[PDB]
Design a protein around this ligand. Structure first.
Ligand code: CDL
Ligand code: CDL
Lengths: 459, 57
């Protein structure tokens, strides 16, 4: 995996040694080259995981997340180079360096063979996101956004640190490949109960679980665009990745300890979708939609059937692309009206038709329109939960109803109706903005043609 | 015929011929504890390094 870590680290002399007008072009170009190279991780096998070294491996779960991570960096560079156009040159290079350092921590978070190195990288990803939110954020409450970001993600991860070292002292190793073959059945006891909670609540915060989700509609709202993109596309998915690694060790105590968290996620996907139906803030609507879609991923990990894990990894990749595109659309209108109020500027198809087409595509992929991989993930999680309990189809279908409702209400409110009379700075769509929308949507549309690469280790 | 000893003589350390045996254990010390075994053998390198969680050296 070192052949991607070293070009990611060479992006730092590539961004600090550039000409002052060339720092976006060079970083965009070479991060696109690294993302071109990221497809060499697709050397997967039906029996064996692609085990590089003692430190790194990449099975079919980490591989689409790595391609998505290495693809998201040029899109963040394109998205952030307008609102930072009046920034200091040194602060601009520091922003680019925080994005590169975050990519560096992510691409060896997903390839961590050993779980405490996963923990070190998994908590190292906070600090660039911390600096991005609480340096280049927008309004006054960006410091309360990162404070509840840093507190929730560390108070959940702190019992995880004791839990992984307890596995280290008892089993002998935190290699995932070793613990595939040395896993013991975890019985029913109170010690094993708090063991399960310590191993799970960190990723429950990072997904987020309903009830633990209150950091997210402030950390996504008060972030700049690259921060919101990476938060909704990768940093939520670190929790699903960690759960799919850690529920190997938590059997069969999961089969009766997962019930209250299955109830929390199955009801919070209804609650947060209803909350999306009544958001005045567009970026908050996309944030609560992200919570509502990750609740299904929590359910599919906690019921641990093969169809559930396939649907959960498909839904993580699909939702990463879709929510990144929706935040970029919301920023494209925030760069014109300077407000995130959704009811402020309406009728924008009368002024921006092609951007309204990108809004339509992102809304249709939001509500899981077939044959997108959004619907593949949504549908497989619904199949596995119907197998889990037949009564859960009511909550699943009701969630899908409310999902289509808030998706098309966002489409109607932002794009349709009568336009606003007292707003006259609505520029034509730049080539950069449509390039950003197309580089989101076209990979998402192409992954419907060959969906098997994003269906995880047990396709 | 007794000559008084000169200055220095009565403080000399003399030798005494005895016919009693030397006390082999005047302190009545019991058996001493056996010492901890020392290290012996050459120093091979650490098997796969520090073994600290993921550090391969
Ligand atoms: C690997 C090789 C692959 C080759 C084939 C490519 C495969 C598909 C890739 C994507 C294709 C579409 C991409 C462009 C459309 C988006 C932008 C747009 O609308 O621009 C308008 C513009 C023309 O319009 P305009 O009049 O100038 O302006 C529009 C107005 O602003 C007003 O705007 P508007 O509202 O009138 O227009 C928006 C309209 C809005 O239309 C709708 O809302 C209706 C669509 C939903 C209902 C109908 C479809 C339902 C699903 C069934 C069909 C799929 C399965 C079929 C198979 C059999 C059944 C299973 O969308 C369209 O007209 C697009 C038609 C195609 C829609 C595809 C599905 C999108 C729905 C959401 C996701 C659904 C699930 C995923 C499906 C994936 C299929 C592959 O289009 C272009 O300029 C196109 C540019 C070239 C596109 C190249 C695409 C390939 C890129 C990949 C590169 C790498 C591989 C190389 C391939 C090269 C091929 C040449
Ligand atoms: C014939 C006679 C002549 C022969 C010459 C042969 C060589 C020719 C070239 C001469 C130069 C050789 C250089 C060292 C050899 C390569 C070492 C290596 O890649 O180890 C892989 C090492 C383990 O991978 P592997 O596949 O298991 O082992 C492959 C080999 O067997 C590795 O061997 P190993 O398994 O025996 O390694 C032992 C162990 C292997 O490692 C482990 O056991 C895993 C634990 C490693 C530490 C993880 C700490 C995590 C928490 C802290 C994270 C810090 C933030 C990250 C950095 C932020 C930015 C500064 O090493 C360590 O624990 C040392 C600590 C990590 C330092 C690695 C060497 C760095 C040298 C250059 C530093 C330049 C700045 C780079 C950024 C600083 C951080 C790396 O990779 C990592 O740990 C990931 C990080 C990447 C490593 C550094 C890459 C070096 C080249 C950087 C070029 C770009 C610089 C850009 C500008 C500055 C930065 C902005």
């Amino acid at each position: 995996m070192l052949k991607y870590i070293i070009p990611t680290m060479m992006l730092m002399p590539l961004t600090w040694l550039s000409k002052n007008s060339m720092i976006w072009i060079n970083t965009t170009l070479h991060s696109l080259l690294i993302s071109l190279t990221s497809l060499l991780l697709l050397n997967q096998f039906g029996d064996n995981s692609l085990n590089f070294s003692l430190t790194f491996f990449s099975d079919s779960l980490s591989t689409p997340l790595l391609i998505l991570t290495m693809w998201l960096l040029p899109l963040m560079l394109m998205a952030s180079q307008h609102h930072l156009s009046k920034e200091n040159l040194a602060r601009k290079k520091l922003f680019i360096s925080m994005l590169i350092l975050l990519q560096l921590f992510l691409i060896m978070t997903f390839t961590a063979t050993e779980l405490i190195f996963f923990y070190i990288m998994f908590e190292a990803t906070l600090v660039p996101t911390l600096i991005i939110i609480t340096r280049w954020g927008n309004q006054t409450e960006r410091l309360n956004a990162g404070l509840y970001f840093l507190f929730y993600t560390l108070a959940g991860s702190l019992p995880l640190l004791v839990a992984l070292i307890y596995i280290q002292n008892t089993m002998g190793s935190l290699n995932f490949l070793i613990l595939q073959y040395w896993v013991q059945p975890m019985p029913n006891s109170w010690s094993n109960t708090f063991m399960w909670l310590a191993c799970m609540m960190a990723f429950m915060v990072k997904m987020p679980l309903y009830g633990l989700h209150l950091w997210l509609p402030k950390a996504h709202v008060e972030a700049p665009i690259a921060g919101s993109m990476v938060l909704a596309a990768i940093l939520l998915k670190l929790g699903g990745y960690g759960m799919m690694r850690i529920t190997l060790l938590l059997n069969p105590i999961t089969d009766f300890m997962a019930y209250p968290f299955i109830m929390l996620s199955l009801w919070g996907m209804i609650m947060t979708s209803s909350i999306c139906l009544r958001q005045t803030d567009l970026k908050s609507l996309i944030a609560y939609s992200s919570v509502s879609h990750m609740a299904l991923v929590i359910v599919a990990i906690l019921i641990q059937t093969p169809w559930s894990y396939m649907g959960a990894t498909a839904l993580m990749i699909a939702h990463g692309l879709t929510s990144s595109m929706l935040f970029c659309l919301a920023n494209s209108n925030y760069e014109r009206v300077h407000s995130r109020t959704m009811i402020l500027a309406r009728g924008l198809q009368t002024l921006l038709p092609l951007m309204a087409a990108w809004w339509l595509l992102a809304s249709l992929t939001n509500l899981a329109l077939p044959p997108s991989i959004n619907l593949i993930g949504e549908l497989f999680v619904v199949m596995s939960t119907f197998s889990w309990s037949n009564i859960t189809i009511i909550l699943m279908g009701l969630n899908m109803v409310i999902t289509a409702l808030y998706s098309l209400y966002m489409l109607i409110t932002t794009q349709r109706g009568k336009h606003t009379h007292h707003i006259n700075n609505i520029l034509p769509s730049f080539t950069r903005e449509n390039a950003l929308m197309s580089l989101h949507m076209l990979p998402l549309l192409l992954l419907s043609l060959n969906p098997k690469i994003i269906l995880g280790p047990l396709y | 015929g007794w000559v008084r000893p000169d200055l220095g003589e009565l403080s000399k350390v003399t030798k005494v011929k005895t016919d009693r045996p030397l006390p082999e254990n005047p302190y009545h010390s019991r058996a001493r504890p056996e010492p901890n075994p020392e290290v012996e053998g050459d120093l091979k390198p650490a098997r796969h390094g520090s073994r600290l969680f993921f550090w391969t050296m």
